[PDB]
Amino acid sequence: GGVTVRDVDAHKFVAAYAAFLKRQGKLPVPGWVDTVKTGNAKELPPQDIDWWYIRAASVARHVYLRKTVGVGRLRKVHGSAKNRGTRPSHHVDASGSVDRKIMQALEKIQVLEKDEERGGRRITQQGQRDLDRIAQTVAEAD
Amino acid sequence: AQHSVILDKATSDKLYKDVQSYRLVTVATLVDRLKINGALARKCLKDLEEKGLIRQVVGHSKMKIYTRA
Amino acid sequence: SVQAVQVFGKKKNATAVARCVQGKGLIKVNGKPLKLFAPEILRAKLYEPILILGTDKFADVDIRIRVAGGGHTSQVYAVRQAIAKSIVAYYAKYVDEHSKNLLKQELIQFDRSLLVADPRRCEPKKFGGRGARARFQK
Amino acid sequence: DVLPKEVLAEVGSVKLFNRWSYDDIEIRDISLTDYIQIRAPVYIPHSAGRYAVKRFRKANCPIIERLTNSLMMHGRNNGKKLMAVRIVAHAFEIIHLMTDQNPIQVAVDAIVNCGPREDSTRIGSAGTVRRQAVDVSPLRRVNQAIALLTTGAREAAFRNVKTIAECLAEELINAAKGSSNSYAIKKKDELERVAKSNR
Amino acid sequence: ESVWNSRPRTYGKGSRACRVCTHQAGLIRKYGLNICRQCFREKAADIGFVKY
Amino acid sequence: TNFNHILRLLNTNVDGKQKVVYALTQIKGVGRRYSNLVCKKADVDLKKRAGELTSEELERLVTIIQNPLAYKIPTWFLNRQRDIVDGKDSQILANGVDSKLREDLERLKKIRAHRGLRHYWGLRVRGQHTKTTGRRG
Amino acid sequence: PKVHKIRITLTSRKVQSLEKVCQELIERAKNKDLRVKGPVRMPTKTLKITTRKTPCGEGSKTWDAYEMRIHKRLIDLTAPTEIVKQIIINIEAGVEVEVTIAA
RNA sequence: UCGGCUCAAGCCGAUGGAAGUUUGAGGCAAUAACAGGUCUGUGAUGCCCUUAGAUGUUCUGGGCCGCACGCGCGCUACACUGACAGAGCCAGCGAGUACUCCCUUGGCCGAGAGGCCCGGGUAAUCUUGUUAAACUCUGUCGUGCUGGGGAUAGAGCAUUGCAAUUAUUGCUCUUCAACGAGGAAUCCCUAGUAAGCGCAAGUCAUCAGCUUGCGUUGAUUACGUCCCUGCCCUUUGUACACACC
Ligand SMILES: [Mg+2]
Ligand SMILES: [Mg+2]
Ligand SMILES: [Mg+2]
Ligand SMILES: [Mg+2]
Ligand SMILES: [Mg+2]
Ligand SMILES: [Mg+2]
Ligand SMILES: [Zn+2]
């Protein structure tokens, strides 16, 4: 039959790809974990330990669905409202360094490459083959 | 008002001889009559589900309800 | 030549354009399958035009739809409105109307809104929606 | 393939709600029909109808959404039908387990029994009340009954360890019979008693 | 001695004024009018402002 | 059964029925963020209450509390700079914040600044409106 | 005689004159055996301004909103540079024209 | 076009039609008037006054925000119909480059606020698909004024402006008040309406709890009457005409 990315639920798929990336277990970390705010609008760090890995994987999911995307777009995609006190809330963006470096490290894993001809970063030939192989690994797992 | 966060044998014994007769078991029921904390009640739901005595009807991230088998 | 029909559906601000091409019984929505593109509880509000009619009547029909603008419930109302017109236009244009008339009558007796849109928009005013500012001592 | 395996069980049979059927409707009384609409089944309550244009358009309308609309009040709960529909469905699931009868089977008897039959009217008397103790029409009876159940659930669950998921559920089973320990009955008996005194 | 107007005026209010009659309170600069609203209303019609 | 529903750290009592991360927040001078950092960096499971821990790991938390900078944490995350004309970083605690708050008042009183004078009279020091504020004296 | 793929842009406040300007231009151009491209329909540009109607601030508070509409109506042609000079003659008041060789 | 009333004027419903309630909402909108507001919008204006020790103009500094108290228009709240953490992911109306930089993509540095370097747009072309909020799924917390609530204040780091103290504002750590649906009284409202939530523009070097518009989700009950507080026509009474103050 053959399956693709569209054939699987996004929420359960992202958990499956995080578990798969556990088995390789090789993505550089500059020690930013457990200290960053992950966003100005936010107030508490995530409880779960592999939040950096689910987030890096989620960044690769959305870059898989868009043709050209940059740090500014991921900056405002993950933003939310902030409780400013007695003032009404607004919309502000998340932290920049965490989202920039979490996908800068994703280049050297051979998942996505630069798009200097017009800008941003796009998905690569052999990079998509990993998510394609995991599509069949999860689809008939049902 | 305050409940117990730990489960001792004095509370353990009521479960394995009473849960065979409840029609519904929920976090509200445990905090109501077992006089236990809500977090301990949710743990009591999850350890007891896997031993194979109760079955899932509907599951959700905010409230979960269980009945007889 | 190739058998195809084009339909479109509208809502308050949700536009759902549809392409019906003679196929083999495949349904896909916005790229995503029908399992995904909806809120979890309202996914039921997608299956009625199929279940009330029967899967056996979707033997050789393929539909591709793009929808944008509005909100989640506007989008699901646009797609549920577009499906009825796509199927009735394909059957009316390309096959005997013995099916078409029973499809149309049974579907509209179950729900009239499948063929007509509901007009509702907002009205501007110089104090807000319909309420004025607070008054001091009447 | 194109349909889920769950709904494939019921698609072969007549169209109905997936979990529960709409057959075997009560035979208990009269004068309340023609205002409760069950001839057209609906899968989910949510619907964008046109029932607020004329006087009696709400008479031909499925009951379940009307309960959902009355369930959401008090400022904060405006526009959240996604939350309301799940809560009401879960309430029917909860009430189904304490009684083998259909949740709509219990719900209909719950509404039909908690409706007041007399009420006191306000006639001016220059500072006094000439309460004439008029009767109540069936449509107003069901309209106020829904309000009493919803405000009873909201008041009971307010500042309590219980949650509205089963807080709403418990009144339907309580009100199914003459329990007399529910909020709706508390308002109901006081209204007939004050009408009886003020006749 | 010629320092009697040493205050620079290129900064917010005071560096701009109404065209028709000098004024600095509530002046519209959007879309490059730089005219007072009171002076605006009598001469609106000719400029092309209308109602619908 | 060593579950003692009472603890005593730095002249204050804390409860044991509630979680470890918020147990340290009870003592004055520490918030949620700092407690989150110290509880994560002490290698303690967050799923157990403050009473289910053992003795040996209890002191090394308060040693971190008294000496913050020695365990590779940022300087801006602390709560003290410029103790005197030349200053060092510090992380002050429950009795410390209470002790430290008073002396700054009469010191700046000695230099006799306007803000200190406002403090001295007790009227609001930060410039703020008064037609509907502070109607208690 | 080298073709330059001319394009001319239009702007005006009123709407009726421009329509007959294009109506006469298309017939003036088709008869000379020139390949003509249709009169595309550019979006109308609506502009709004809000100010207080009263000049002093007394009494009740009420506002009025002035507005303005603009049309563009772009047209292009494929022809040499010198030919369009005699093809763009006889224009009336109000309508302004801007020429772009687009070489 | 048709049904059920009437000689007529007229009203209600259905089918084609989205509609027929005047399809919905607006702009403009009678005679005669107020000792209503404005000389502090105007090089519109009578009279009076000061006019070189100037009430003209201009520069420095401060004030219009100063606080025992009563009142109005608003914002966040009094929690489980909740808070917190990860994931899923849907709009519209508008705005943008000078004789000096205006909205701003992409790349790098930077906890954060920010900094540096190429580049696009005088604009259905680039910002912008403005992938906003609400909302949905999976977990933590468990009724305790607690992880609801954020007043008050200390220390540190930045941008804007000639100049930031009575901090302009933003960011990091810490301090963790009152507040359990609120008395006598009182305002607004009939379907994409009330309420919940955000966005665009204005004043602006920077600051929105303000106003004018735009969009997402979208309700209970009535389709009446003149009882209170008011309006219109006729008959009627008057010792009122500055007119029941
Ligand atoms: Mg408005
Ligand atoms: Mg008039
Ligand atoms: Mg003067
Ligand atoms: Mg507290
Ligand atoms: Mg602004
Ligand atoms: Mg008389
Ligand atoms: Zn002027």
Side-chain angles (χ1 to χ4, degrees):
Chain A
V3 310
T4 184
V5 175
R6 279 70 172 175
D7 183 32
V8 66
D9 170 76
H11 182 74
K12 181 263 290 181
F13 175 85
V14 302
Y17 205 87
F20 179 81
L21 187 148
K22 299 288 95 176
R23 293 182 183 174
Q24 288 85 19
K26 62 178 72 66
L27 199 174
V29 172
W32 278 117
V33 294
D34 187 74
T35 188
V36 296
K37 181 143 175 187
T38 62
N40 203 15
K42 189 64 65 68
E43 74 285 25
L44 272 193
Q47 286 67 67
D48 201 338
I49 62 170
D50 59 356
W51 61 259
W52 179 75
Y53 300 71
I54 185 67
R55 177 70 161 272
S58 83
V59 158
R61 281 83 66 190
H62 295 285
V63 69
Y64 181 76
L65 277 296
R66 332 168 199 185
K67 322 305 201 185
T68 290
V69 65
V71 292
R73 266 74 58 86
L74 279 297
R75 183 67 171 290
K76 67 96 174 179
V77 159
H78 292 132
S80 296
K82 179 170 183 105
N83 303 347
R84 313 152 70 219
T86 62
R87 302 301 174 52
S89 61
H90 284 131
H91 165 95
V92 66
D93 60 357
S95 176
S97 314
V98 55
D99 296 12
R100 172 165 91 238
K101 311 317 152 293
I102 196 165
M103 61 79 71
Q104 280 188 356
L106 185 62
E107 289 273 333
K108 65 155 294 303
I109 316 166
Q110 290 66 245
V111 175
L112 60 85
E113 88 277 27
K114 189 34 185 175
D115 190 359
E116 61 87 20
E117 53 94 14
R118 90 186 67 160
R121 274 87 184 253
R122 67 143 56 91
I123 290 293
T124 186
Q125 175 66 42
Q126 44 85 34
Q128 64 180 20
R129 283 273 200 152
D130 291 331
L131 278 296
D132 209 38
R133 188 270 197 170
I134 305 305
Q136 307 87 25
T137 63
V138 57
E140 50 257 22
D142 60 350
Chain B
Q2 63 85 28
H3 296 269
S4 171
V5 67
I6 58 164
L7 189 165
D8 56 10
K9 275 313 155 193
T11 52
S12 190
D13 49 7
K14 65 178 71 66
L15 277 296
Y16 297 0
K17 64 91 178 179
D18 290 330
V19 299
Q20 285 81 241
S21 159
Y22 306 113
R23 290 186 147 279
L24 278 298
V25 54
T26 59
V27 297
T29 46
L30 282 61
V31 66
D32 189 359
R33 64 178 64 187
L34 273 45
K35 176 46 153 164
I36 65 175
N37 198 287
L40 183 63
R42 267 176 307 113
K43 299 184 293 293
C44 294
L45 278 297
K46 60 183 69 63
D47 62 302
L48 188 152
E49 63 87 20
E50 55 80 17
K51 66 175 176 64
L53 189 78
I54 287 187
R55 60 181 204 273
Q56 177 76 269
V57 294
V58 291
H60 204 277
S61 314
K62 80 188 197 183
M63 283 74 74
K64 63 208 177 285
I65 62 170
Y66 283 139
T67 179
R68 304 161 162 167
Chain C
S1 66
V2 161
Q3 307 186 340
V5 66
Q6 63 85 30
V7 72
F8 65 94
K10 189 66 176 49
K11 205 61 198 307
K12 57 192 299 172
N13 295 115
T15 186
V17 64
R19 302 296 89 191
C20 181
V21 298
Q22 175 190 45
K24 193 41 64 191
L26 186 147
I27 305 300
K28 203 81 171 185
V29 57
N30 295 297
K32 304 331 311 173
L34 61 83
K35 195 265 171 175
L36 280 298
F37 203 96
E40 284 283 347
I41 62 170
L42 315 179
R43 281 169 184 168
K45 189 62 72 185
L46 293 174
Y47 294 101
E48 69 275 13
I50 299 90
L51 66 85
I52 68 170
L53 294 186
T55 185
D56 63 331
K57 298 293 101 179
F58 292 99
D60 272 18
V61 292
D62 185 17
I63 297 89
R64 284 90 180 266
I65 62 170
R66 177 71 273 172
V67 64
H72 52 294
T73 61
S74 283
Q75 288 204 23
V76 63
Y77 268 104
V79 64
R80 63 159 315 274
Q81 288 296 106
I83 190 167
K85 301 179 293 291
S86 66
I87 62 170
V88 299
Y90 177 89
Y91 284 103
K93 196 40 179 181
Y94 292 162
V95 184
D96 60 357
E97 75 277 16
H98 182 74
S99 85
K100 176 266 202 181
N101 272 118
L102 63 85
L103 274 294
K104 190 263 178 179
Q105 301 274 48
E106 178 207 330
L107 176 141
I108 184 160
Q109 58 81 21
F110 282 135
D111 191 356
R112 305 160 60 168
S113 64
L114 276 296
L115 275 296
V116 296
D118 192 74
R120 285 177 292 177
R121 206 61 161 100
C122 296
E123 69 91 11
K125 188 268 183 181
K126 207 167 64 183
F127 268 81
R130 183 66 62 89
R133 187 184 170 169
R135 175 171 184 154
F136 213 82
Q137 263 168 349
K138 179 61 71 67
Chain D
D1 44 22
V2 64
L3 275 296
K5 281 54 156 163
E6 186 265 7
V7 297
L8 293 174
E10 282 83 0
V11 65
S13 47
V14 297
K15 165 52 207 71
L16 294 173
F17 192 24
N18 47 285
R19 190 61 265 174
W20 297 279
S21 62
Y22 289 97
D23 291 322
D24 297 334
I25 198 68
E26 297 83 3
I27 43 173
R28 74 281 186 193
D29 73 328
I30 208 60
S31 86
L32 187 151
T33 186
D34 204 333
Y35 283 5
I36 297 306
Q37 188 274 151
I38 61 171
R39 58 91 175 173
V42 65
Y43 194 113
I44 207 70
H46 204 318
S47 295
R50 191 70 274 170
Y51 302 122
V53 291
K54 188 62 188 296
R55 312 196 300 252
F56 308 82
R57 298 292 179 90
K58 282 92 171 196
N60 186 329
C61 173
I63 308 301
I64 299 299
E65 67 271 17
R66 184 180 320 83
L67 282 70
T68 62
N69 306 120
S70 296
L71 211 55
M72 65 205 278
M73 66 182 179
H74 267 276
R76 187 177 50 276
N77 313 308
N78 286 300
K80 296 184 289 294
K81 271 63 57 185
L82 280 296
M83 167 157 162
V85 181
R86 64 157 280 183
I87 300 299
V88 66
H90 289 174
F92 292 166
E93 293 179 353
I94 288 177
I95 61 174
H96 170 43
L97 293 174
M98 284 74 74
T99 70
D100 313 327
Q101 52 185 300
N102 205 2
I104 65 171
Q105 272 317 304
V106 65
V108 176
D109 291 331
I111 61 184
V112 66
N113 67 9
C114 65
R117 285 173 310 271
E118 294 293 328
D119 190 357
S120 174
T121 187
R122 276 285 305 97
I123 283 183
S125 302
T128 309
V129 285
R130 267 297 96 193
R131 312 297 198 96
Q132 204 85 330
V134 65
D135 64 356
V136 177
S137 78
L139 63 84
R140 174 141 168 111
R141 213 190 311 177
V142 65
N143 289 312
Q144 203 178 357
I146 302 297
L148 276 296
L149 282 71
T150 62
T151 190
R154 184 262 178 187
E155 190 277 331
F158 181 73
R159 306 288 298 161
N160 189 2
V161 298
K162 65 182 181 293
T163 73
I164 290 162
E166 74 293 341
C167 180
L168 183 63
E170 62 179 1
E171 293 84 4
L172 275 296
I173 303 296
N174 201 8
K177 279 74 176 175
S179 88
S180 72
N181 74 20
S182 72
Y183 177 106
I185 308 175
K186 292 330 172 284
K187 286 270 182 135
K188 179 211 151 53
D189 62 332
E190 61 86 20
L191 293 174
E192 321 92 350
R193 199 171 70 63
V194 298
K196 204 44 53 186
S197 67
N198 220 137
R199 295 164 91 62
Chain E
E1 188 276 332
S2 298
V3 301
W4 181 58
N5 201 6
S6 43
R7 179 71 274 172
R9 289 169 171 78
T10 61
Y11 186 70
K13 278 79 69 176
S15 65
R16 173 250 284 180
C18 183
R19 279 191 194 178
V20 177
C21 63
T22 179
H23 193 270
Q24 293 84 14
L27 274 287
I28 298 90
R29 40 154 166 67
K30 163 142 188 293
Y31 184 75
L33 281 296
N34 299 279
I35 287 174
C36 275
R37 49 181 77 258
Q38 295 80 16
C39 302
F40 180 81
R41 300 297 185 91
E42 69 273 14
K43 306 151 146 178
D46 60 273
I47 300 298
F49 310 110
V50 66
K51 196 53 211 83
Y52 298 104
Chain F
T1 309
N2 62 21
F3 192 30
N4 53 5
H5 310 157
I6 297 297
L7 294 174
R8 188 63 181 239
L9 278 297
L10 176 47
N11 300 114
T12 302
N13 294 311
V14 311
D15 172 64
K17 310 284 281 190
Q18 49 84 30
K19 287 207 134 178
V20 291
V21 64
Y22 292 177
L24 190 63
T25 63
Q26 188 281 336
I27 62 170
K28 186 182 291 267
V30 61
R32 199 164 325 271
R33 309 262 213 176
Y34 184 73
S35 177
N36 292 316
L37 183 63
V38 296
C39 66
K40 195 69 185 179
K41 182 153 282 191
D43 186 271
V44 185
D45 54 355
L46 294 170
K47 309 182 269 293
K48 302 250 184 83
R49 311 313 192 124
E52 283 328 309
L53 279 296
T54 60
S55 161
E56 69 274 15
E57 68 274 16
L58 295 176
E59 56 277 6
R60 186 268 187 188
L61 277 294
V62 67
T63 67
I64 297 171
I65 301 299
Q66 282 78 80
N67 183 327
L69 188 151
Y71 293 62
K72 276 74 73 175
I73 68 176
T75 180
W76 50 260
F77 188 76
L78 309 189
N79 191 0
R80 185 58 199 182
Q81 273 96 37
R82 189 149 150 160
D83 50 22
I84 205 60
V85 294
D86 312 279
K88 54 151 71 193
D89 298 332
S90 304
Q91 172 74 238
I92 192 65
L93 271 300
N95 313 127
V97 299
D98 282 348
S99 305
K100 277 171 65 178
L101 70 87
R102 313 182 284 285
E103 79 259 16
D104 291 330
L105 277 296
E106 66 280 5
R107 66 177 66 251
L108 189 152
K109 171 64 50 203
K110 183 40 180 175
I111 63 170
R112 194 268 324 174
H114 79 278
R115 60 169 294 165
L117 294 174
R118 299 285 297 199
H119 275 112
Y120 181 75
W121 290 283
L123 184 66
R124 192 55 272 159
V125 306
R126 295 291 278 159
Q128 64 85 30
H129 292 88
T130 60
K131 299 289 94 176
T132 309
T133 61
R135 183 248 179 278
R136 327 280 311 292
Chain G
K2 189 260 286 184
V3 175
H4 287 93
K5 264 178 306 203
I6 193 66
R7 183 166 71 176
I8 65 168
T9 63
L10 188 153
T11 42
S12 50
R13 296 229 61 81
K14 181 265 292 184
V15 64
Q16 290 322 81
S17 71
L18 69 87
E19 307 302 6
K20 296 181 290 295
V21 159
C22 317
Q23 268 314 286
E24 61 82 15
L25 183 62
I26 301 299
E27 311 324 323
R28 191 178 312 185
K30 63 83 181 166
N31 60 3
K32 54 212 311 179
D33 188 342
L34 261 64
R35 183 214 286 146
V36 176
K37 187 188 256 218
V40 59
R41 296 275 151 82
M42 188 52 163
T44 178
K45 300 289 94 178
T46 300
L47 187 153
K48 176 59 77 182
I49 62 170
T50 299
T51 184
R52 285 93 67 196
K53 76 152 175 51
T54 177
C56 277
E58 201 262 350
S60 66
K61 306 317 316 172
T62 186
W63 311 66
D64 62 357
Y66 295 110
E67 67 274 11
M68 321 308 146
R69 312 156 166 209
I70 311 281
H71 323 83
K72 189 268 184 181
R73 282 303 174 101
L74 182 63
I75 192 69
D76 61 357
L77 212 64
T78 184
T81 306
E82 296 298 327
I83 189 167
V84 65
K85 305 312 292 168
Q86 64 258 24
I87 207 64
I88 191 168
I89 54 161
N90 188 327
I91 183 67
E92 68 269 355
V95 179
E96 80 206 356
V97 66
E98 186 286 335
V99 177
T100 43
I101 190 169

